[PDB]
Amino acid sequence: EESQAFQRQLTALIGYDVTDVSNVHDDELEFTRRGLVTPRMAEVASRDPKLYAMHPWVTSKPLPEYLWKKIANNCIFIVIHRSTTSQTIKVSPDDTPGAILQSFFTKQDFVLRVCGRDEYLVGETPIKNFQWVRHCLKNGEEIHVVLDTPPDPALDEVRKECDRKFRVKIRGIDIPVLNTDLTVFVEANIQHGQQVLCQRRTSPKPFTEEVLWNVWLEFSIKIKDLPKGALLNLQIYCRLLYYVNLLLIDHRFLLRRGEYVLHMWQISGFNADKLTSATNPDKENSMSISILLDNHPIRAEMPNQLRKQLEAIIATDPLNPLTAEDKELLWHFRYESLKHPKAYPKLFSSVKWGQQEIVAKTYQLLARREVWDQSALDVGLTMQLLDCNFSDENVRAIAVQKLESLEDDDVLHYLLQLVQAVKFEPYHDSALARFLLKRGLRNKRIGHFLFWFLRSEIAQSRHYQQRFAVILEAYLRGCGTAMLHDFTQQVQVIEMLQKVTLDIKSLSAEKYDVSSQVISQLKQKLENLQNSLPESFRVPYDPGLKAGALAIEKCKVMASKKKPLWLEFKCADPTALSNETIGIIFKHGDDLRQDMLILQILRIMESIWETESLDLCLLPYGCISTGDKIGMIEIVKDATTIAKIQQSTVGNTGFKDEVLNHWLKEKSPTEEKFQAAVERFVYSCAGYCVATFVLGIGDRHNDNIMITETGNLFHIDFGHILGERVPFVLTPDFLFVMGTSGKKTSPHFQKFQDICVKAYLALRHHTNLLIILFSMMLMTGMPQLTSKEDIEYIRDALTVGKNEEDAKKYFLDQIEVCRDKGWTVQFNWFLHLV
Numbered sequence: 001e002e003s004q005a006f007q008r009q010l011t012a013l014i015g016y017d018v019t020d021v022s023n024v025h026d027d028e029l030e031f032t033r034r035g036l037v038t039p040r041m042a043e044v045a046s047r048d049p050k051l052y053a054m055h056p057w058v059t060s061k062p063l064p065e066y067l068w069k070k071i072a073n074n075c076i077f078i079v080i081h082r083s084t085t086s087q088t089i090k091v092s093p094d095d096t097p098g099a100i101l102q103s104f105f106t107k108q109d110f111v112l113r114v115c116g117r118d119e120y121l122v123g124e125t126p127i128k129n130f131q132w133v134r135h136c137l138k139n140g141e142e143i144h145v146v147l148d149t150p151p152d153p154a155l156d157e158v159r160k161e162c163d164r165k166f167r168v169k170i171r172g173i174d175i176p177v178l179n180t181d182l183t184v185f186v187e188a189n190i191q192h193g194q195q196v197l198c199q200r201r202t203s204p205k206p207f208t209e210e211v212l213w214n215v216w217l218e219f220s221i222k223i224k225d226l227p228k229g230a231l232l233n234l235q236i237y238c239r240l241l242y243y244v245n246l247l248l249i250d251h252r253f254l255l256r257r258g259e260y261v262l263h264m265w266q267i268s269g270f271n272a273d274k275l276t277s278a279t280n281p282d283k284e285n286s287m288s289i290s291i292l293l294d295n296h297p298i299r300a301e302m303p304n305q306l307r308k309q310l311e312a313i314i315a316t317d318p319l320n321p322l323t324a325e326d327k328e329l330l331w332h333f334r335y336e337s338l339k340h341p342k343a344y345p346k347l348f349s350s351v352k353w354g355q356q357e358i359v360a361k362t363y364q365l366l367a368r369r370e371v372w373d374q375s376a377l378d379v380g381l382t383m384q385l386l387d388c389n390f391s392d393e394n395v396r397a398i399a400v401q402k403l404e405s406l407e408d409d410d411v412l413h414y415l416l417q418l419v420q421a422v423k424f425e426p427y428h429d430s431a432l433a434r435f436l437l438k439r440g441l442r443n444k445r446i447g448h449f450l451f452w453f454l455r456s457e458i459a460q461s462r463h464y465q466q467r468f469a470v471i472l473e474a475y476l477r478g479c480g481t482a483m484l485h486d487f488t489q490q491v492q493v494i495e496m497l498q499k500v501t502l503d504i505k506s507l508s509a510e511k512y513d514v515s516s517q518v519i520s521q522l523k524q525k526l527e528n529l530q531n532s533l534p535e536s537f538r539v540p541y542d543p544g545l546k547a548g549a550l551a552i553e554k555c556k557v558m559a560s561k562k563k564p565l566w567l568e569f570k571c572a573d574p575t576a577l578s579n580e581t582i583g584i585i586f587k588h589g590d591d592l593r594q595d596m597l598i599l600q601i602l603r604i605m606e607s608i609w610e611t612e613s614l615d616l617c618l619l620p621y622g623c624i625s626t627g628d629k630i631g632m633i634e635i636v637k638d639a640t641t642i643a644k645i646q647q648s649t650v651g652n653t654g655f656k657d658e659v660l661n662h663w664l665k666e667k668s669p670t671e672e673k674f675q676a677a678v679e680r681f682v683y684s685c686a687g688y689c690v691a692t693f694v695l696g697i698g699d700r701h702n703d704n705i706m707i708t709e710t711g712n713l714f715h716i717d718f719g720h721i722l723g724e725r726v727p728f729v730l731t732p733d734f735l736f737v738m739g740t741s742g743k744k745t746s747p748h749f750q751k752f753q754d755i756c757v758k759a760y761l762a763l764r765h766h767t768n769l770l771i772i773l774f775s776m777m778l779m780t781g782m783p784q785l786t787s788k789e790d791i792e793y794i795r796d797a798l799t800v801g802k803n804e805e806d807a808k809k810y811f812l813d814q815i816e817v818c819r820d821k822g823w824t825v826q827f828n829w830f831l832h833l834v
């Protein structure tokens with residue numbers, strides 16, 4: 001029975017009962033639950049308990065130039081606390097936590113914990129190499145450290161537990177309901193990495209609630225020739241309305257045989273949902289298609305001009321399409337191509353996956369894969385091999401093979417996109433899934449995040465939740481009883497909080513109406529909850545923080561188009577430094593997945609900029625989508641919208657240039673501090689300007705841009721909340737802080753535009769990585785996005801194909817257009833929302 005209680009607890013954590021059989025036509029999921037057990041226990045067993053327990057967060061990257069500046073002493077200062085006792089040691093960047101530890105007693109079961117958060121500075125790592133330290137240098141703060149005992153690893157314990165042609169028969173389609181009368185027909189395709197190897201169509205028939213053809217669609221392709229990972233894709237056109245897929249080769253390497261009745265997905269009035277092997281859970285309202293399967297298996301050197309040809313091909317963007325020529329060139333000279341890792345995606349797209357002799361040659365090629373493994377890891381390339389263009393398990397495994405060399409810091413960087421890329425795997429068990437399982441179980445930070453990212457999908461994607469539940473379930477059985485306990489506390493609060501949010505939204509108006517009625521109602525429910533509700537819970541976007549009791553006094557309902565709750569919690573650490581509450585917004589009615597994808601690319605932009613020694617002061621705040629159209633947002637303290645700043649000085653509606661500067665100086669404690677704010681505004685303004693431009697989310701209304709009293713500017717509410725055009729927002733008030741009016745420069749403005757250029761060129765160095773992240777995010781984070789047209793934006797913006805000077809020129813032009821437009825575009829937004 002312990003087992004039932006435990007599978008039920010798991011079901012509760014996960015949000016889906018992986019033992020559900022109601023929407024399946026085979027045993028792939030179970031098989032996969034079984035398959036993943038090995039990789040779990042292998043990593044549980046493998047992991048160092050003390051290290052798993054304390055999870056030091058580290059990098060092996062260089063300290064950026066900009067941080068060494070903060071320290072030229074060659075000595076850093078760390079404050080060590082014990083109750084009131086509090087010495088203040090100074091140390092060397094190359095010092096180790098131990099050394100410094102022993103060094104401290106010069107003035108053994110003790111360890112240094114960051115004050116107020118469950119973050120531990122430990123292990124054989126130079127202090128400079130701890131992120132928290134870096135974060136502290138980055139923000140000009142003292143490294144406050146208490147000394148306490150190491151957490152007991154005992155709490156991390158794990159519970160002991162044919163040459164025939166291929167054909168298919170289309171029997172008919174069936175729907176319960178149906179506006180006019182029109183013709184309908186069925187299109188069957190065989191697909192491998194979104195390349196259709198063959199296509200057959202039935203004849204049209206009148207569209208009645210049941211339509212039958214009972215036909216054999218015999219394909220040109222041979223059985224022998226079907227590749228593992230191939231999809232039988234079935235679609236109804238009447239305009240395409242419905243789709244479903246079925247893998248032609250099963251998880252055991254066997255050809256599919258028998259009768260299938262598949263409940264289809266409908267197209268709303270390209271994307272990754274379109275490649276799912278899953279069928280629609282909705283049998284009562286779904287369209288179905290009935291089919292029958294009755295058919296288990298298993299040196300000359302390149303001349304000079306031609307290699308010039310090859311090379312040109314390789315240097316093209318990932319979005320460049322390849323001609324029949326390019327493909328032959330790539331494949332006939334494959335042994336040459338194998339020497340250019342940068343060419344592997346293009347080459348593997350030139351393979352005729354529908355000829356078994358070729359696939360066999362391809363695998364051979366994979367054996368002489370020497371240049372590839374030697375290669376310095378390239379995340380652009382690796383990601384490209386994990387997108388919708390490759391269904392081959394061996395090709396994808398090599399990418400995954402390069403991923404193995406990522407340190408945890410880097411895995412945290414790409415974890416969301418890596419998790420999203422599992423939607424591009426043909427089967428539920430895959431090397432990437434195993435990779436992701438391994439690293440979460442290896443590190444608690446990655447685990448924590450892997451937990452929520454997988455739960456995000458499970459809660460809101462009928463198309464991949466089954467696959468993801470199995471992966472999450474596997475993670476849960478190796479994290480340890482401590483993480484389980486923690487996750488349970490998180491799921492309880494958020495599950496709680498979402499209801500409160502739901503009830504209130506359910507009592508509240510479409511218009512901007514807040515009343516004591518509503519707030520009373522807000523506080524009452526909070527009052528109920530407040531009185532058990534777990535004592536403490538870990539903040540999901542920031543696992544170091546422990547959130548304590550509500551400060552119901554400070555909680556309110558926000559005046560936003562939905563009714564987000566503004567909540568403030570006491571910290572649960574007595575070791576913490578301040579009285580400051582932890583502020584979290586909680587909302588239903590936005591799709592946070594989309595916000596989640598952007599802020600992660602923004603974290604990726606920052607890290608790229610760090611490689612080139614730049615810090616553009618982005619503020620990609622925490623955001624998790626916890627369920628369908630619901631999740632949480634971090635509140636950056638001391639922040640207001642640019643629109644409010646206008647409101648409070650100018651009329652409620654309509655726009656003065658001088659206002660933002662007034663606001664900053666008035667908020668500033670001192671001139672020293674005011675001048676720091678201006679400097680921070682300049683960097684962050686540029687950063688948002690370049691980053692936003694590249695992602696094509698530049699044109700924004702004022703209510704959706706924010707600044708802190710410290711001068712840090714940041715955008716909000718991506719994905720998308722309100723909408724002559726502008727590349728980005730560089731308005732007169734912004735110019736004014738920087739010291740300019742009209743077409744006149746300033747030492748600061750000069751500073752702003754050179755930074756923009758420095759920043760933009762840094763990004764174009766990773767043109768390929770960004771194009772692929774961007775295209776991937778559209779496919780897995782938007783509902784649907786029109787393959788070639790939408791993706792293409794990022795090339796024009798990355799100015800693919802030009803040298804640096806032209807690029808530099810181009811971006812300065814964009815700045816001029818912003819200079820040209822003033823308040824024009826802002827004004828029209830006000831009008832659109834008036």
Ligand SMILES: Nc1cc(C(F)(F)F)c(-c2nc(N3CCOCC3)nc(N3CCOCC3)n2)cn1
Binds near residue numbers: 560621633
């Ligand atoms: N998808 C979404 C949704 C929202 C929200 F909360 F408005 F619904 C937000 C949001 N996020 C915030 N933040 C987040 C960063 O820290 C400051 C507060 N503020 C707002 N405002 C609503 C109108 O008055 C100004 C404050 N909105 C972000 N992304």
